[PDB]
């Protein structure tokens, strides 16, 4: 029941009155705590300002153009060979493999897994990925 | 209602009997509830008839003819009530025409020290009751701390000046009798800082409300946090305010640290994000170069070489997707920082300009309490507030002296008679006094009873101005030391022409330091002839007294010339400066509930003193030494009305002793 915007904890009252010089010590202490936080800000602002200058250039010299490829259901000997190497490199990553081949949906790839499981030693290939 | 209003105007509950009524009518309060109402109606109706016309004595015969049935059937009941009210001064008090001329057979002898209002009121009653009453007054005038300066057209009260509402105030009754002229006070009070420019509205209100908040803060601090003792000494209203303020200054700094700590937290997230993007960009840059080299192994290539291009391409657009996500995260972090950088909490709790205007409101409080706030009891300083009268505070335009003078008509007053010694014994009392003009002339006054209205300042004096033989008991002296007797002063400035704002009764001067805050802090227009009063409060009160009149009027004209211009403030035709603490018949202004004291101390003061038996083994003597005055009335100290009531009281008490009830 204090008035609005007044701030009077039983804890703070005892902390200010416990000693003859206590309130000035409480208040000057907070002062010297706010001064050290403000220079911590300054330090981070300048550390950050240095990082932003390294990102000048974005990644735009490095983005490739986004080729779209109409998905096809026919597996070429070429596209099969990509799939093995993709399993060799990426493991169970059905999205990545779909991306590398370019024209095979994620489903077709998981289908490719069991379909050609026996013939391409796809069990052995997945073992080699775990090196 | 009108019958109910009479009770309220008599400071009485209308539907209940009081403790004092219980004492005189214990058959009725312990009796059935019906007779209680009959009693209560008779009491209220008798009060009403008196209140409805206080210029004529309301006799018992008159009261009975005016009651309607069935209330006029128990005439003995009516007679008890009427005599009760008369004795305790609830009816037929102040200045009325008597129907019955006073009986020449006078009974008992009473010496009253002081003809302040308390002394005067008691005297008039005791005379009405048929006793022999003589007043001894040290000054050359009546009125005590009611003291009106008069010179030519100029009239200005150096003492009491305000009627603190008429609703329930006995001075409302008096003013009908004395036809004194009362006037309201316009509440607008422009404050001018020491530079003479005014305080703008935005800030006057911002601070007044902050001041009102800080007060309530101490009361919460007092009642809810039991913060009334600190290092074995009683906490003062001053210390509480200082603690409250420190806590607001603490909380302002707390908010700043919380706010800037939200910024480091966010800046440090940004730091880690940027680090992730810089290491991601370098990893992307390297990868792109690899794809570029693989993409330049011109076909026809075997399938591992085709895998490498398609592989690197995949790896690369994946990392570019990662980077784009991180930079959208960087957008929403960098704007949260623009957010916090644009809502910084309050910079300071109060500025030096602010804290000075705050000091003005403190001085204003120091003024009406007539003491530095460091000396007011935190726990009990506002205790008399539960009994505020209702209605507007008024000033006495024609001079408050009109009252104590009118009261003195017909009384035997010995002016220029300073009491030196009060002797009280089983057989009676001796008051020794001297002529103030020629202290070698000595006077002995023998009396049945002595009523003391010596100011609390005077009782406080060391070494004593008045010696009691035998010495007042410890329980009385210790209350005398405990209580606070304070101090305020005025400077009367009489000009020949009004240069201030006439539609404005008050304006302020803001002191430049906490210490000087009481020094000429308020200027008051209220009289017909062009007169400004200038008030001095707080720690400034005592200090200004050791400064010459001419310097004080200098400081005044200096402040005024700063406000209205040098070209517009003429020299005063006449000036007066009160110095109430140095006045030897006052020794200060009025009482205040000092820290370490309470309102119970005010009661102790009113307790009469009973001497011990002359001969040993002799029956219990009756009380001989009685006490009135503003320091003797718990619920209404430090006022004229409180003094008046206190005198009414003692007169009733003395008459009950020496005439029988
Ligand atoms: C500056 C000032 C302003 C005030 N303004 C207001 C106001 O606006 N409203 C309000 O309600 N109250 C006000 N008061 C308070 C009010 O005036 C007093 O409470 C009251 O009037 C005092 O009356 P009293 O009869 O108790 O004592 P006093 O009037 O002080 O009377 C005591 C008498 O005893 C005399 N005396 C002292 N020593 C001796 C001695 N040794 N021998 C003989 N006689 C002696 C004194 O000279 C005096 O006449 C003010 C007080 C002061 C000081
Ligand atoms: C403009 C203005 C108007 C009124 C008051 C005021 N209000 C209320 C008062 O209550 C009496 C107090 C007695 C001590 N316990 C608290 C109540 C007194 C005073 C007062 C009035 C005049 C003088 C003088 N000279 C001194 C004080 C002040 C300024």
Annotated binding site of B for FAD: 118, 137, 139, 145, 161-162, 630, 639-640
Measure the CA–CA gap between A125 and B529, rounded to whole angstroms. Answer: 114
CB distance B458 to B586 below 8 Å: yes
B277 and B346 fall within a common domain: yes
State the DSSP code for B93: -
Of all ligands present, the nearest one to the C-alpha of B169 is 1
> Any idea of the CA torsion for B560, B561, B563, B564, to the nearest 10 degrees?
110
Looking only at the bridges linking them, the beta strands covering B428-435 and B442-447 are: antiparallel
Among B368, B456, B634, the mutation site with the greatest number of ligand 2 atoms within 8 A of its Cβ is B368
Residue matched to tokens 């035998």: B470
Domain boundaries, chain A: 1-131
Residue B56 β-bridge partners: B97
Phi/psi of residue B111, nearest 5 degrees: -100, 125
Question: Other CB atoms closer than 10 Å to residue B630's CB: what's the count?
Answer: 29
Measure the CA–CA gap between B448 and B456, rounded to whole angstroms. Answer: 24
Q: Which of B242, B286, B311, B333 to mutate to test the interface with A (most CBs of A within 10 A)?
A: B311
Report CB contact under 8 Å: A7, B251. yes
Secondary element (H or E) of residue B492: strand B489-494
> Any idea of the CA torsion for B546, B548, B552, B553, to the nearest 10 degrees?
160
Give the 3-state DSSP-derived string for B382-433, with helices as H, strands as E and coil as C: CHHHHHCCECCCEEECCCCCHHHHHHHCCCEEECCEEEEEEEEECCEEEEEE
Measure the CA–CA gap between B52 and B271, rounded to whole angstroms. Answer: 85
Among B147, B157, B162, B580, the mutation site with the greatest number of ligand 2 atoms within 8 A of its Cβ is B162
B93 and B125 fall within a common domain: no
Q: How many helices (H) and strands (E) does chain B have?
A: 19, 24
Q: Identify residues after which chain B is interrupted (C–N over 2.5 A).
A: none
CB distance B381 to B593 below 8 Å: yes
For every residue of B338-372, DSSP letters joined together read HHHTT-PPPS-SS-HHHHHHHHHHHHHHHHHHTS-
CB distance B508 to B187 below 8 Å: no
CB distance B268 to A44 below 8 Å: yes
Where a domain ends, among B47, B80, B108?
Answer: B108
Q: Identify residues after which chain A is interrupted (C–N over 2.5 A).
A: none
Measure the CA–CA gap between B500 and B521, rounded to whole angstroms. Answer: 16
Cis peptide bond N-terminal to B300, omega within 30: yes
Secondary element (H or E) of residue B162: strand B162-163
Q: What is the CA radius of gyration of chain A?
A: 32
Residue matched to tokens 């995949």: B314
Phi/psi of residue B412, nearest 5 degrees: -90, 100
Q: What is the CATH number of the domain that holds B280?
A: 1.10.287.80
Compute CA B26 distance to the chain's CA centroid, rounded to the nearest angstrom.
37
Report CB contact under 8 Å: A61, B288. yes
Residue matched to tokens 């070489």: B305
Measure the CA–CA gap between B644 and B389, rounded to whole angstroms. Answer: 15
B356 and B397 fall within a common domain: yes
Give the burial string for B262-286 (b: 16+ CB within 10 Å, else e).
ebbebbeebbebbeebeebbeebee
Where a domain ends, among B303, B324, B350?
Answer: B350
B261 and B181 fall within a common domain: no
Report CB contact under 8 Å: B291, A40. no
CB distance B213 to A5 below 8 Å: yes
- Coil/strand/helix, residue A3: coil
81-120 in B: which are within 8 Å (CB) of A? none
B321 and B376 fall within a common domain: no
* Residue B47, C-beta contacts closer than 8 angstroms, at least 6 positions apart: B6, B7, B9, B10, B12, B85, B90, B91
Compute CA B609 distance to the chain's CA centroid, rounded to the nearest angstrom.
30
Resolution of the experimental model, in Å, one decimal: 3.0
Where a domain ends, among B309, B328, B350?
Answer: B350
Reported as half-sphere exposure (CB side, CA atoms, 13 A), residue B299 has a value of 8
CB distance A38 to B263 below 8 Å: no
B10 and B90 fall within a common domain: yes
Report CB contact under 8 Å: B261, A47. no
Spatial strand order of the sheet with B182-184 comes to B162-163, B394-396, B182-184
Measure the CA–CA gap between B645 and B630, rounded to whole angstroms. Answer: 9
B379 and B496 fall within a common domain: yes
CB distance B49 to B58 below 8 Å: yes
Spatial strand order of the sheet with B428-435 comes to B442-447, B428-435, B417-425, B467-469
320-339 in B: which are within 8 Å (CB) of A? 320, 323, 327
Question: Other CB atoms closer than 10 Å to residue B365's CB: what's the count?
Answer: 19
Residue B134 β-bridge partners: B111, B412
**Solving technique:** X-ray
265-304 in B: which are within 8 Å (CB) of A? 267-268, 270-271, 274-275, 277-278, 281, 284-285, 287-288, 291, 303-304
Question: Tokens standing for B578?
Answer: 């009160």
Looking only at the bridges linking them, the beta strands covering B484-485 and B506-509 are: unpaired
Phi/psi of residue A22, nearest 5 degrees: -75, -40
Total number of domains constituting chain B? 3
Measure the CA–CA gap between B654 and B97, rounded to whole angstroms. Answer: 23
Range of the domain at B252: 235-350
CA distances from B349 to A25, B210, B276 (A): 17, 11, 42
Secondary element (H or E) of residue B239: helix B237-295
Query: What topology is assigned to A1-131 in CATH?
Result: Methane Monooxygenase Hydroxylase; Chain G, domain 1 (1.20.58)
Cis peptide bond N-terminal to B463, omega within 30: yes
Question: Tokens standing for B153?
Answer: 């057209």
Residue of chain A whose alpha carbon sits nearest to that of B327: A58
Residue B414 β-bridge partners: B136
Measure the CA–CA gap between A108 and A115, rounded to whole angstroms. Answer: 10
CA distances from A22 to A28, B222, B307, B372 (A): 10, 20, 74, 24
Chain B residues in contact with A4 by the CB 8 A cut-off are 213
Is the alpha carbon torsion for B466, B467, B468, B472 positive or negative?
positive
Looking only at the bridges linking them, the beta strands covering B394-396 and B182-184 are: antiparallel
Q: Is the Cβ atom of B162 under 6 angstroms away from ligand 2?
A: yes
Residue B154 β-bridge partners: B151
CB distance B422 to B466 below 8 Å: yes
Report CB contact under 8 Å: A55, B317. no
Measure the CA–CA gap between A87 and A84, rounded to whole angstroms. Answer: 5
CB distance A122 to A116 below 8 Å: yes
If you measure from the C-alpha of residue B454 to the centroid of ligand 1, how many angstroms do you get, rounded to a whole number? Answer: 9
- Coil/strand/helix, residue B149: strand
| B657: closest CA of chain A, how far (Å) | 50
B567 and B577 fall within a common domain: yes
């Amino acid at each position: 029941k204090p008035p609005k915007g007044m701030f009077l904890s039983q804890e703070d009252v005892e902390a200010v009155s416990a000693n003859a010089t206590a309130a000035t010590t409480v208040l000057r202490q907070l002062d010297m705590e706010l001064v050290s936080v403000k220079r911590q800000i300054q330090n981070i602002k300048q550390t950050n300002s240095a990082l932003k200058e390294k990102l000048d250039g974005g990644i735009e010299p490095y983005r490739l153009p986004e080729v779209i490829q109409k998905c096809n259901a026919r597996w070429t000997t070429e596209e099969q060979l990509l799939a093995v190497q993709a399993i060799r490199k990426y493991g169970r990553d059905f999205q990545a493999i779909s991306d590398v081949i370019g024209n095979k949906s994620v489903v077709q790839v998981k289908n490719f897994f069991v379909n050609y499981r026996r013939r391409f030693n796809i069990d052995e290939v997945l073992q080699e990925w775990e090196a | 209602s009108g019958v109910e209003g009479a009770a309220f105007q008599s400071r009485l509950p209308h539907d209940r009997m009081t403790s004092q009524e219980a004492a005189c009518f214990p058959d009725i309060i312990s009796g059935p509830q019906q007779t209680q109402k009959v009693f209560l109606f008779i009491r209220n109706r008798t009060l009403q008839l008196w209140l409805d016309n206080p210029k004529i004595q309301l006799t018992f015969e008159a009261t009975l003819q005016q009651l309607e049935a069935p209330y006029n059937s128990d005439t003995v009941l009516v007679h008890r009530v009427h005599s009760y009210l008369e004795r305790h001064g609830l009816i037929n008090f102040g200045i009325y025409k008597r129907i019955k001329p006073l009986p020449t057979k006078k009974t008992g002898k009473v010496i009253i020290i002081g003809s302040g209002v308390s002394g005067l009121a008691a005297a008039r009653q005791l005379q009405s009751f048929g006793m022999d009453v003589t007043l001894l007054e040290a000054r050359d005038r009546v009125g005590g701390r009611v003291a009106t300066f008069r010179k030519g057209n100029y009239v200005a009260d150096l003492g009491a000046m305000v009627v603190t509402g008429l609703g329930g105030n006995p001075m409302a009754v008096v003013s009908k009798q004395v036809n004194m002229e009362l006037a309201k006070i316009k509440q607008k009070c422009p404050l001018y800082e020491a530079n003479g420019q005014a305080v703008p509205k935005e800030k006057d209100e911002m601070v007044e409300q902050e001041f009102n908040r800080l007060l309530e803060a101490t009361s919460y601090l007092s009642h809810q946090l039991d913060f009334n003792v600190l290092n074995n000494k009683p906490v003062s209203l001053g210390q509480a305010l200082e603690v409250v303020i420190q806590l607001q200054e603490k909380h302002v700094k707390d908010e700043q640290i919380e706010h800037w700590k939200k910024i480091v937290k966010t800046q440090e997230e940004l730091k880690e994000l940027l680090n992730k993007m810089v290491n991601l960009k370098e990893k992307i840059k390297e990868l792109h170069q690899q794809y570029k080299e693989a993409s330049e192994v011109k076909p026809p290539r075997d399938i591992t070489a085709e895998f490498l291009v398609k592989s690197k391409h995949r790896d690369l657009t994946a990392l570019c997707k990662e980077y784009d996500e991180l930079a959208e995260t960087q957008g929403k972090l960098e704007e949260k920082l623009q957010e916090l950088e644009a809502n910084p909490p309050s910079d300071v709790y109060l500025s030096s300009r602010d804290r000075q205007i705050l000091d003005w409101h403190f001085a204003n409080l120091e003024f009406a309490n007539a003491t530095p706030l460091s000396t007011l009891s935190l726990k009990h300083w506002d205790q008399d507030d539960d009994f505020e009268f209702t209605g507007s505070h008024l000033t006495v335009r024609n001079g408050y002296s009109c009252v104590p003078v009118a009261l003195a008509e017909g009384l035997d007053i010995k002016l220029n008679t300073a009491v030196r010694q009060v002797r009280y014994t089983a057989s009676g009392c001796e008051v020794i006094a001297v002529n103030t003009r020629s202290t070698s002339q000595t006077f002995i006054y023998k009396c049945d009873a002595v009523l003391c209205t010596l100011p609390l300042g005077v009782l406080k004096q060391q070494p004593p101005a008045v010696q009691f033989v035998p010495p007042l008991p410890e329980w009385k002296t210790s209350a005398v030391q405990r209580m606070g007797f304070g101090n305020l002063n005025k400077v009367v400035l009489c000009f020949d022409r009004v240069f201030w704002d006439p539609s404005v009764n008050l304006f302020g001067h803001v002191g430049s330091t906490t210490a000087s805050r009481g020094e000429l802090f308020l200027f008051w227009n209220l009289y017909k002839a062009p007169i400004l009063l200038a008030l001095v409060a707080g720690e400034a009160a005592g200090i200004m007294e050791n400064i010459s009149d001419d310097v004080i009027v200098g400081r005044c004209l200096a402040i005024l010339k700063g406000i209205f211009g040098s070209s517009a403030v003429p020299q005063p035709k006449e000036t007066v400066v009160s110095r109430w603490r140095a006045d030897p018949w006052a020794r200060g202004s009025y009482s205040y509930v000092a820290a370490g004291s309470s309102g119970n101390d005010y009661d102790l003061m009113a307790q009469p003193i009973t001497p011990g038996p002359s001969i040993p083994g002799a029956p219990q003597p009756i009380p001989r030494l009685f006490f009135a005055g503003e320091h003797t009335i718990r619920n209404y100290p430090a006022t004229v009305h409180g003094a008046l009531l206190s005198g009414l009281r003692e007169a009733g008490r003395i008459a009950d002793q020496f005439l029988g009830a």
